Amino acid sequence: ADLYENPMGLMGFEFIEFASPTPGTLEPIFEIMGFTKVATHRSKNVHLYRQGEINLILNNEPNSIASYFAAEHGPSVCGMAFRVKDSQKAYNRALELGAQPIHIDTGPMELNLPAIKGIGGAPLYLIDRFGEGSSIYDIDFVYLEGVERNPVGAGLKVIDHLTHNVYRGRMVYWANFYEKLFNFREARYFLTSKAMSAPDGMIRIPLNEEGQIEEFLMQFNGEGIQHVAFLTDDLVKTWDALKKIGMRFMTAPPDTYYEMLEGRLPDHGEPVDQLQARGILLDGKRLLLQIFSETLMGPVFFEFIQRKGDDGFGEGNFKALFESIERD
Amino acid sequence: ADLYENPMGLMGFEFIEFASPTPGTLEPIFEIMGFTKVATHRSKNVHLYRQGEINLILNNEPNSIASYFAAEHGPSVCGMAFRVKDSQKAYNRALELGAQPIHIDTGPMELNLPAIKGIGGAPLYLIDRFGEGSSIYDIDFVYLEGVERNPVGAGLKVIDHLTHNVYRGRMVYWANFYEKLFNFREARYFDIKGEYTGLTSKAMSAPDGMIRIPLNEEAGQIEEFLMQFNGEGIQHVAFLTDDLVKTWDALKKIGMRFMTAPPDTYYEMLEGRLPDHGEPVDQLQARGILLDGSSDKRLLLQIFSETLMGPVFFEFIQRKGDDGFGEGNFKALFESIERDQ
Amino acid sequence: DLYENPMGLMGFEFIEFASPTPGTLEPIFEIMGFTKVATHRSKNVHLYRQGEINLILNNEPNSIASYFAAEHGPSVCGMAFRVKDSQKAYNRALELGAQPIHIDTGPMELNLPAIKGIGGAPLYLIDRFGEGSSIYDIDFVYLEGVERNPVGAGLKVIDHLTHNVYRGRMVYWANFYEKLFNFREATSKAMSAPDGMIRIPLNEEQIEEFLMQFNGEGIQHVAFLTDDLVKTWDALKKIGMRFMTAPPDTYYEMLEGRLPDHGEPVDQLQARGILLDGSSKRLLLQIFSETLMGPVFFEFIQRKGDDGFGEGNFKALFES
Amino acid sequence: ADLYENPMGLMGFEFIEFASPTPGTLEPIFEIMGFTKVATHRSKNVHLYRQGEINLILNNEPNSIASYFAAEHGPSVCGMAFRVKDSQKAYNRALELGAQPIHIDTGPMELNLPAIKGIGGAPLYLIDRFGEGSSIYDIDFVYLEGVERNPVGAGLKVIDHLTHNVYRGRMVYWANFYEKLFNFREARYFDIKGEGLTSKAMSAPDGMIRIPLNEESAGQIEEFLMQFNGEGIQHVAFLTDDLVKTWDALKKIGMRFMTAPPDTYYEMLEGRLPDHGEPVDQLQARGILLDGSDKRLLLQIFSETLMGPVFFEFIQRKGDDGFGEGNFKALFESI
Numbered sequence A: 001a002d003l004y005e006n007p008m009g010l011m012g013f014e015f016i017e018f019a020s021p022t023p024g025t026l027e028p029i030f031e032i033m034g035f036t037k038v039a040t041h042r043s044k045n046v047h048l049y050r051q052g053e054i055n056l057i058l059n060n061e062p063n064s065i066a067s068y069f070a071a072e073h074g075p076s077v078c079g080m081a082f083r084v085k086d087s088q089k090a091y092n093r094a095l096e097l098g099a100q101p102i103h104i105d106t107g108p109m110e111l112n113l114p115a116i117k118g119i120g121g122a123p124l125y126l127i128d129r130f131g132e133g134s135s136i137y138d139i140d141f142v143y144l145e146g147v148e149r150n151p152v153g154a155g156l157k158v159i160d161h162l163t164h165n166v167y168r169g170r171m172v173y174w175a176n177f178y179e180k181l182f183n184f185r186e187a188r189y190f191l192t193s194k195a196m197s198a199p200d201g202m203i204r205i206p207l208n209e210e211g212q213i214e215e216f217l218m219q220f221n222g223e224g225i226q227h228v229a230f231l232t233d234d235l236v237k238t239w240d241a242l243k244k245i246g247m248r249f250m251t252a253p254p255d256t257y258y259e260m261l262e263g264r265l266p267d268h269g270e271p272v273d274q275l276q277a278r279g280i281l282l283d284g285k286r287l288l289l290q291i292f293s294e295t296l297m298g299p300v301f302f303e304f305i306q307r308k309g310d311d312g313f314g315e316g317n318f319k320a321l322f323e324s325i326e327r328d
Numbered sequence B: 001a002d003l004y005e006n007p008m009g010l011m012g013f014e015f016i017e018f019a020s021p022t023p024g025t026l027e028p029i030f031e032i033m034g035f036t037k038v039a040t041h042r043s044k045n046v047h048l049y050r051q052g053e054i055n056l057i058l059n060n061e062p063n064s065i066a067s068y069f070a071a072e073h074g075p076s077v078c079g080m081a082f083r084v085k086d087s088q089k090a091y092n093r094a095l096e097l098g099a100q101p102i103h104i105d106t107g108p109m110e111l112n113l114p115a116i117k118g119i120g121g122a123p124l125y126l127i128d129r130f131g132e133g134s135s136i137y138d139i140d141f142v143y144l145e146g147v148e149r150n151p152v153g154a155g156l157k158v159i160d161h162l163t164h165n166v167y168r169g170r171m172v173y174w175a176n177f178y179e180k181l182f183n184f185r186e187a188r189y190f191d192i193k194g195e196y197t198g199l200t201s202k203a204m205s206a207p208d209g210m211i212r213i214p215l216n217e218e219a220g221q222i223e224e225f226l227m228q229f230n231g232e233g234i235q236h237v238a239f240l241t242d243d244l245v246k247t248w249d250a251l252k253k254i255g256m257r258f259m260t261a262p263p264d265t266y267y268e269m270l271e272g273r274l275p276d277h278g279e280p281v282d283q284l285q286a287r288g289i290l291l292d293g294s295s296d297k298r299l300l301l302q303i304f305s306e307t308l309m310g311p312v313f314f315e316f317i318q319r320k321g322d323d324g325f326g327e328g329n330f331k332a333l334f335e336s337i338e339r340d341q
Numbered sequence C: 001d002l003y004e005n006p007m008g009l010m011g012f013e014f015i016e017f018a019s020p021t022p023g024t025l026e027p028i029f030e031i032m033g034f035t036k037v038a039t040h041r042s043k044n045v046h047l048y049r050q051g052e053i054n055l056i057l058n059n060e061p062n063s064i065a066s067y068f069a070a071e072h073g074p075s076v077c078g079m080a081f082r083v084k085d086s087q088k089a090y091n092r093a094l095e096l097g098a099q100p101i102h103i104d105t106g107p108m109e110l111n112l113p114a115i116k117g118i119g120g121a122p123l124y125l126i127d128r129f130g131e132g133s134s135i136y137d138i139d140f141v142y143l144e145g146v147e148r149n150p151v152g153a154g155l156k157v158i159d160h161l162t163h164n165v166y167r168g169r170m171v172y173w174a175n176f177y178e179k180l181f182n183f184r185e186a187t188s189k190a191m192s193a194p195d196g197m198i199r200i201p202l203n204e205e206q207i208e209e210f211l212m213q214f215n216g217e218g219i220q221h222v223a224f225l226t227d228d229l230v231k232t233w234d235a236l237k238k239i240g241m242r243f244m245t246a247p248p249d250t251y252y253e254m255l256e257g258r259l260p261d262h263g264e265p266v267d268q269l270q271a272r273g274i275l276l277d278g279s280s281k282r283l284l285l286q287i288f289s290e291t292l293m294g295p296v297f298f299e300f301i302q303r304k305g306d307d308g309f310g311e312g313n314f315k316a317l318f319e320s
Numbered sequence D: 001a002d003l004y005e006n007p008m009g010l011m012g013f014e015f016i017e018f019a020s021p022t023p024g025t026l027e028p029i030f031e032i033m034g035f036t037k038v039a040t041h042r043s044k045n046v047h048l049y050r051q052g053e054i055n056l057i058l059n060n061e062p063n064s065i066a067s068y069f070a071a072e073h074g075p076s077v078c079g080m081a082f083r084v085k086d087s088q089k090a091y092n093r094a095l096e097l098g099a100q101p102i103h104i105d106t107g108p109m110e111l112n113l114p115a116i117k118g119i120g121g122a123p124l125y126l127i128d129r130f131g132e133g134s135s136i137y138d139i140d141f142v143y144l145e146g147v148e149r150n151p152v153g154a155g156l157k158v159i160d161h162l163t164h165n166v167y168r169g170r171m172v173y174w175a176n177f178y179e180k181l182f183n184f185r186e187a188r189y190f191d192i193k194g195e196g197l198t199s200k201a202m203s204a205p206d207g208m209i210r211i212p213l214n215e216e217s218a219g220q221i222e223e224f225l226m227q228f229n230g231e232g233i234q235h236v237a238f239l240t241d242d243l244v245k246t247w248d249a250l251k252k253i254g255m256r257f258m259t260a261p262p263d264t265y266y267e268m269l270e271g272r273l274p275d276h277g278e279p280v281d282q283l284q285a286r287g288i289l290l291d292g293s294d295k296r297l298l299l300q301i302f303s304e305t306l307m308g309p310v311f312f313e314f315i316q317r318k319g320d321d322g323f324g325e326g327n328f329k330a331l332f333e334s335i
């Protein structure tokens, strides 16, 4: 696959799964982020929200793996599916390499989803059914009558990355996990972090241990996914699209963050006034634009990124943001 | 029992279970702590070590829940059992209240021991078969021929407490876990200036007044344990003795490794810290035994081992009216060291 | 130039050769189409050139190179990477745990930084290159008259060089190049540098017999690109180039079958023992010399879309 | 009592050195093997563990030769030291013969330690300072206050031998290395039918240093070389005056031995070694192995692997000067 040795035939993110011990707390979060309910499971209280190529699964099955996850962690990403070319080739290798299976209970005439124990114990699914017509959603879900099958929403296209926050000294443990099992490699350049990149060139999972990280671990009651980043081709248009449907972003940087923009990023070319009108951040000629939601699902938040050459994660915005509240 | 409403019918610790990813590492520790191997499982490679009313299970079965725990955490307490009046009722009650079952594979003609997922994933077993002739050891274990089945060892009598280290914020989680399922309650302890000691340590105590499970959270001793243990779990196991000086001598004879004794600055301040405590100071100083309490003379004697199973260490305690855990010794020891610096 | 390049690699700069026995590397460069074009200012080392390929014969006694050749015979004793800035690259490699190799340097010559590489050969990190600015313009003296930029038999660049390693070390050296230079893995592992130019396949088992003869890990073969193998072949054969003995004619009967269309003059390949690989379109032409520097041999390759190394030629040759 | 010409003035092993890229991985192994930490370097994070006349050095010094070596090879013997009469003479001779210097960084007011490149890159030290008061430990280490400096531990006395696993065809290289520099000689060969180990016992001219070289032929030597990321010391054998009592002492403190042979191994002992005289019941209960052939005997037992693929041997010699090579055929027949 695309990048390097993909002995697991990873083909990108398939879905991410959410659940909440409190009803009606996840549905409005999906809507303000431009996602559309498009299908409901054939027999479980489980729902599919879509935007672009992003599949968001809302799991409200009671007495389930996901509800036990939610009861301990609160509103959360409790599951994460990887696309693979052959789910048995990968499920059996992962167990041979020592992965722990998690049994997801499956109803009659429904698909058996193979899953292993992942970050915080959340299932990591290996799904080899995909595409319109043959995907797991066509088989086990029922689409709403006459609803647009592939909503575009506010222009989020893919999951660009999601992070894991991990306790002090666990990052080598979770780096090993993704290396040994999926042939992830840390990309490496040049707060402590390891950008784990998958051989498919689509899955990126950065790992953080520490403030900001320690507060997540306490509020989340464990390791887990701290933020999911959605890619868009035009963050500025996406920004306006999201704000008109109720999106709440991190409060904008002080204006002095934009005076330095030409200083720290000569000839970036971006309309400075449009980014400042919306508090959009910038890092990079390889460039990227990004902006964050507030914490919406406990301490879990969301990122919206547009890449203009830069393949990083906006790390330079810590120095930029701090040294802007230094002159303001 | 006694203290609180006891809806699970708790009646004290039943056993704690140990596993290790490396062989011959738990066995020499049980021996130097005065435990005797009394029985071996009818079919599994699991062994019963005994001293007084203390039951320790060494679980050497491979590819087991216990073996995975020890592979992830090192040599460790990999489980614990509570005596309950009715295991079927308590267990059902746990599940209804949101506990998660842990399936422990039981073989032909062995007992189905129910258990729920506990700290670090370790099984918490709920056992209603106990006492001589009726115990799970009598049913599922074979006592070594000859060997005395009620050894006194070095005089350790009962498990007094198992204090856990948990990640920051998880002390509220586990306190509520134990409150909701079992009606454990915190006992708040107060130091020498009358100030609450439980900011980062909840002395969760079962309604039977026997089970004590202190929950600790923190660049100090707790986070070092969490790293070295690779998770949350029991940091030390405290055994009660009726005479700690006598127990100490028995332990030293068979090779116990104790923590280095406090500087004798510690034993001078003893009359000032605990006026008219009445203990034979020279005896305690010779052995590095610690003394805490308040003088109504309510006192306790305690000594700790070195770390013996990874970061897990052991405590030997004699209670003489004090219901606490020796938290007065932190300040006492620090001042001893500053009078020695 | 094709993914993240933290070390600023810009392709092979040169490769270094040494021999414990004089007069034994000099003929092998000439018959491969290389020509002495410069001699060091102060050391018995000589620059042979063809296209953009820079070959260094280091004869200097009591040296880094001499000891390496003494333990491993005639050999590639060293390898240089072009880098944007070599102080940045060297410092970072040390930061990431590489070990330095002292290359002794004399008055008024260049301090060439290098780290420990395969078989302990120095991996130089060179940031001086191009017309009038290269290390050769500085540390070498060109022969008067004879052109500085020979075209030779049309060999253009080092396409790749493969390491042979002990069993199990293939993941060590893969992580060596991954961690240090962000190579990625595009029985053997083909490591590709982010510059799109440096390719270093690693082999562990043919390979055992190299390790024995070489007395350790090292560069098994060096592959040279050309724009036409047939014309390069004629050019090489005219100066005494020694190739592998040609394959069996059946190899060329299975040819059209294994490669539908392909579009290659089957006749001129066989007149020369040239081999073929690809899909059938991507393709590549290749030919190998005999073992010329101990167990070290050389490959002459022409690419026709195929990013591969002709691995299918194993089955092809042994289904013959 | 040298055996033949001793041009380097060898006088026995001095220390072996260990390093690991993971903290706390070497210390418990030393403890379960009966070693006691008796001293710490004057300035570096390096410690001296001792049992009988065995000096083991735990080298935790970062950014050092040891740490680079452990980085490549894992927990390991990163260094070996020979006692010599005159370390300046030996070292100069080694260099003149083509040995390669290894520079070990020496702090102010500490000893310059001479070392040449040895097995797998590990320094081979030449140490001419030994004896209570005159040792390199007395000079550059600080003994714990009070502690006894010559602990007997579980009764291990000296390094009997240690091996090198080398790649195929490298045995000739490493035989030559020890022959050319130190006049080690192969003095004894035990025949082993191909039922893949080939071995070469190199004996130094002092009669004390013995280094068997092992290469392969998919087995135990290649599994080491893969796990170790190269050639290196495979096991260290410690001599004891009574393996049974040493065994008891080692089991008490956590030693992890190889699981005993099947009982057929002990039924075949009289057949294999008629009238050997050893208490078979005591050996079988402990899984102790017996070999030999004039009742030349040897008792040995091995640990499990304890630092990556390095393991340890505990051996009581009763006339047999071999290495227990008879135990391969005998365990083959046992199972």
Ligand SMILES: Cc1cccc(C)c1-n1c(=O)c2cc(C(=O)C3=C(O)CCCC3=O)ccc2n(C)c1=O
Pocket: A161, A163, A193, A206, A207, A212, A250, A281, A292, A301, A303, A313, A314, A315, A317, A318, A321
């Ligand atoms: C969103 C927010 C809320 C409250 C407090 C704070 C610090 C922040 N916050 C971020 O979380 C944040 C995250 C990333 C980021 O996405 C990220 C990394 O930092 C590196 C690993 C890979 C990765 O994805 C980049 C910049 C950020 N900036 C600039 C920021 O301010």
Ligand SMILES: Cc1cccc(C)c1-n1c(=O)c2cc(C(=O)C3=C(O)CCCC3=O)ccc2n(C)c1=O
Pocket: B161, B163, B201, B214, B216, B221, B259, B304, B313, B315, B325, B326, B327, B329, B330, B333
């Ligand atoms: C044994 C050791 C080794 C290295 C470092 C140190 C601080 C210690 N150490 C202790 O761990 C220790 C623990 C308790 C204790 O048992 C305990 C707590 O006070 C929290 C509540 C529940 C509980 O059981 C009391 C006194 C102690 N003292 C005095 C001590 O020195």
Ligand SMILES: Cc1cccc(C)c1-n1c(=O)c2cc(C(=O)C3=C(O)CCCC3=O)ccc2n(C)c1=O
Pocket: C160, C162, C188, C190, C201, C206, C244, C288, C299, C309, C310, C311, C313, C314, C317
């Ligand atoms: C030249 C020769 C002499 C005596 C014995 C033999 C096997 C050979 N020999 C080769 O060495 C050879 C090498 C490659 C090759 O270039 C190569 C690899 O196959 C692995 C990945 C990177 C790489 O560059 C391809 C085909 C080959 N074929 C077909 C061949 O016969």
Ligand SMILES: Cc1cccc(C)c1-n1c(=O)c2cc(C(=O)C3=C(O)CCCC3=O)ccc2n(C)c1=O
Pocket: D161, D163, D199, D200, D212, D214, D220, D258, D289, D302, D303, D313, D323, D324, D325, D327, D328, D331
């Ligand atoms: C311990 C273990 C674990 C897994 C596999 C195996 C073969 C073994 N193993 C040994 O390694 C072993 C080594 C020696 C030995 O020390 C010795 C040398 O000193 C030099 C010459 C070669 C040789 O045999 C003797 C007997 C042995 N026996 C009997 C044994 O079983």
Ligand SMILES: [Co+2]
Pocket: A161, A227, A229, A303, A313
């Ligand atoms: Co991000």
Ligand SMILES: [Co+2]
Pocket: B161, B163, B236, B238, B315, B325
């Ligand atoms: Co306690």
Ligand SMILES: [Co+2]
Pocket: C160, C162, C221, C223, C299, C309
């Ligand atoms: Co090639």
Ligand SMILES: [Co+2]
Pocket: D161, D235, D237, D313, D323
């Ligand atoms: Co041996």
